[PDB]
Each structure stands twice: as structure tokens, then as C-alpha cells.
Amino acid sequence: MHKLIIKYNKQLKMLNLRDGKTYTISEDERADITLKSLGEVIHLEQNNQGTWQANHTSINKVLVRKGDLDDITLQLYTEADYASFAYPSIQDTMTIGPNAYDDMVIQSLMNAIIIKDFQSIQESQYVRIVHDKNTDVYINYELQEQLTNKAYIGDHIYVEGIWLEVQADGLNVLSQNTVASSLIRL
Ligand SMILES: [Cl-]
């Protein structure tokens, strides 16, 4: 698996890079990924050893190229960054953040977020994510305005470099940095 997250001027995009294929990120509406006022064209393809590159530069974990209105950040995740965690058995809140007391501790995070209401997820089909005004949260690659947002089963969340996928029994996560947790790893 090679999932590329593209960030530019608070816009967020995603591509699942597949072996042997080529992609384009540009202002063109026909491109694989279209970003308005990008001012650059980025071709994604593998070198001869199969390593993904952006305009012939290996991406590795993260690659940044300046664009018209902001830096364009490409973050590439692989199965090595994947983990699954079960929701707490009885508490109805769960936190992900850089603090020693967060349920899922990830040092690279600037602020923590709260995931709640999963105890009734079998019935509602969603959880709520709470964040502060200084934390950008995207749900299915759309920046959220409100501080508390609903995330249904199957939805993808992106916040401060980490990807989350809401499921009935817990969360799937993609993080390039180690995750320490008191939660059960599924
Ligand atoms: Cl996704």
C-alpha cells in the first residue's frame, strides 16, 4: 500500500498510488488531483526500483515543494505506518495527542483531539470528533468548520499528519511516527 496525502493552501487530496501507474497533480481539471492556483505541475511515477517520485525526486516520508500560495506537502504512507486500535471498553471518550495521558500518544501532534460517543456507534453509525480552533481537522478530505464534527463508519479523518478510519470496533490509523497506547491493538 502507498497512500499519498497532498496538502496545499488548506486543501487536502488523496491518491492510492498503484504499481506501474503515473499521475499528475496540477491546476487542470482533468489531472488526477486538481488544485486551483497551484502554479506547478507534479508528475508522480516510480523510478526503476519502484520508488515513488514527484518530478523525479523520491518522496520517502514527506516531500515539500513551494507553490503559488503555500508549500505543497506530499506525505506518503505504507503498511508500515498502519495500526488498528479497539475503542475503550467502558469510557465513552478517547483522546489522540502528544500528552502522556492521551489514550493514543503520538509525539508529533501539536494538539490532542477527542473521539467520543462510540459506545452507541452500533446504533448511530458515527462518532464525534472534537478539536480546538487551532487544529485543522478534515473528514473525507474536507476541512471542518465546527469544533465538533460527526464522523461515520467508513469515513476518513486527517489531522496533524495522521490518518484515521472510523470502524464499528475501533479506529484504523496511519502514522509515520510511533504510536504509544493503552488501548488494545487489533
Ligand atoms: Cl483514504
Swiss-Prot record:
Component of the type VII secretion system (Ess). Required for the secretion of substrates including EsxA and EsxB. However, unable to support secretion of the substrate protein EsxC. The chain holds residues 1 to 186 of 1479 of the full protein. Homooligomer. Interacts with EsaE. It comes from Staphylococcus aureus (strain MW2). Disulfide bonds: none annotated. This is Type VII secretion system protein EssC. Residues 1-186 are cytoplasmic. Belongs to the EssC family. It is found in: Cell membrane.
